[PDB]
Ligand binder design. Sequence first.
Ligand code: HEC
Ligand SMILES: [Ca+2]
Ligand SMILES: [Ca+2]
Ligand SMILES: [Ca+2]
Ligand SMILES: [Ca+2]
Length: 106
Amino acid sequence: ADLEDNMETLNDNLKVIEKADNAAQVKDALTKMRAAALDAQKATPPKLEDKSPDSPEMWDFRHGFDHLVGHIDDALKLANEGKVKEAQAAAEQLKCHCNACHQKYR
Ligand code: HEC
Ligand SMILES: [Ca+2]
Ligand SMILES: [Ca+2]
Ligand SMILES: [Ca+2]
Ligand SMILES: [Ca+2]
């Protein structure tokens, strides 16, 4: 549903997470993020123009959303187990996924 908007959704919900008060909020943000990541994973960034879905760049692109959903799952667990700050920290550790893709395909 538009790659810009998917990316806005991940960004945004990182902020709510840092600012959050209780796991239920954090739980909801990570939900939004996960869906965003799966939707984004289906799109074609401008730099990957006329690259066939079997190209390494488009494989690598889709791959990058896979590691990230993993780490979002791994953080959601902490959420459902009431463990806020540790999930608020796991969330921070997600910026490792953000940087790597961007530097390649933004
Ligand atoms: C590739 C597998 C990506 C990962 C993982 C993340 N981002 Fe991304 N982002 C990606 C691309 C290819 C682009 C450019 C889209 C375009 O319109 O050119 C972006 C852009 C953003 C932006 C800017 C959005 C805007 O208003 O134009 C933001 C704020 C952003 N991305 C955030 C973001 C965060 C917070 C991520 C980790 C949780 C993250 N992205 C991962 C590609 C990829
Ligand atoms: Ca746009
Ligand atoms: Ca924008
Ligand atoms: Ca928008
Ligand atoms: Ca905004």
